Amino acid sequence: PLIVPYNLPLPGGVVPRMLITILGTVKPNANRIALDFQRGNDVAFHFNPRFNENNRRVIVCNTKLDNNWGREERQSVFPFESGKPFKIQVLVEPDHFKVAVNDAHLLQYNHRVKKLNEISKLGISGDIDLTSASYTMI
Ligand SMILES: OC[C@H]1O[C@@H](O[C@H]2[C@H](O)[C@@H](O)[C@H](O)O[C@@H]2CO)[C@H](O)[C@@H](O)[C@H]1O
């Protein structure tokens, strides 16, 4: 497998029709998963499934600019399960990141960081075994 935290370069950054596919297994007793699309120190798109936030499972999305978190966008649909293999697909669209999990549309995140060509790293972290992380152009 791959080592977590894992950082995947996005050469020349992200562009519409770029599809990123993450395969992994959620650890038993997992607490968190995080995908961080980075523009230098800023986090353009933080995708953060939380398995126990006040005894609820929730996905938090946010952007971090100059070390400051913005308005969180929370999704209560939680297709992840401890112990079980997942597929995360992030499709870059002109106005948002489109996320599907195990082939089901999960959420959309309107681009707050506008310089898409400067979002050049994807950090992958959390309580998972990482099987594969790749991108393609569709
Ligand atoms: O917004 C993503 C960001 O959240 C941080 O935790 C927040 C928490 O979600 C919020 O409910 C609370 O009031 O403030 C905390 C600190 O901002 C996480 O620490 C961070 O990892 C990100 O996931």
Curated annotation (Swiss-Prot):
Coiled coil: none annotated. One of its GO terms (molecular function) is laminin binding. It is found in: Cytoplasm; Nucleus; Secreted. GO terms for biological process: eosinophil chemotaxis; epithelial cell differentiation; innate immune response; macrophage chemotaxis; monocyte chemotaxis; mononuclear cell migration; mRNA processing; negative regulation of endocytosis. Residues 6-136 form the Galectin domain. Its main location: cytoplasm. A motif (Nuclear export signal) lies at residues 114-129. Keywords: Acetylation, Cytoplasm, Differentiation, Disulfide bond, IgE-binding protein, Immunity, Innate immunity, Lectin, mRNA processing, mRNA splicing, Nucleus, Phosphoprotein, Repeat, Secreted, Spliceosome. One of its GO terms (cellular component) is extracellular exosome. The modification Phosphoserine is found at residue 76. A beta-D-galactoside binds at residues 69-75. A major expression is found in the colonic epithelium. It is also abundant in the activated macrophages. Expressed in fetal membranes. Galactose-specific lectin which binds IgE. May mediate with the alpha-3, beta-1 integrin the stimulation by CSPG4 of endothelial cells migration. Together with DMBT1, required for terminal differentiation of columnar epithelial cells during early embryogenesis. In the nucleus: acts as a pre-mRNA splicing factor. Involved in acute inflammatory responses including neutrophil activation and adhesion, chemoattraction of monocytes macrophages, opsonization of apoptotic neutrophils, and activation of mast cells. Probably forms homo- or heterodimers. Interacts with DMBT1. Interacts with CD6 and ALCAM. Forms a complex with the ITGA3, ITGB1 and CSPG4. Interacts with LGALS3BP, LYPD3, ZFTRAF1 and UACA. Interacts with TRIM16; this interaction mediates autophagy of damage endomembranes. Interacts with cargo receptor TMED10; the interaction mediates the translocation from the cytoplasm into the ERGIC (endoplasmic reticulum-Golgi intermediate compartment) and thereby secretion. This is Galectin-3. It comes from Homo sapiens (Human).
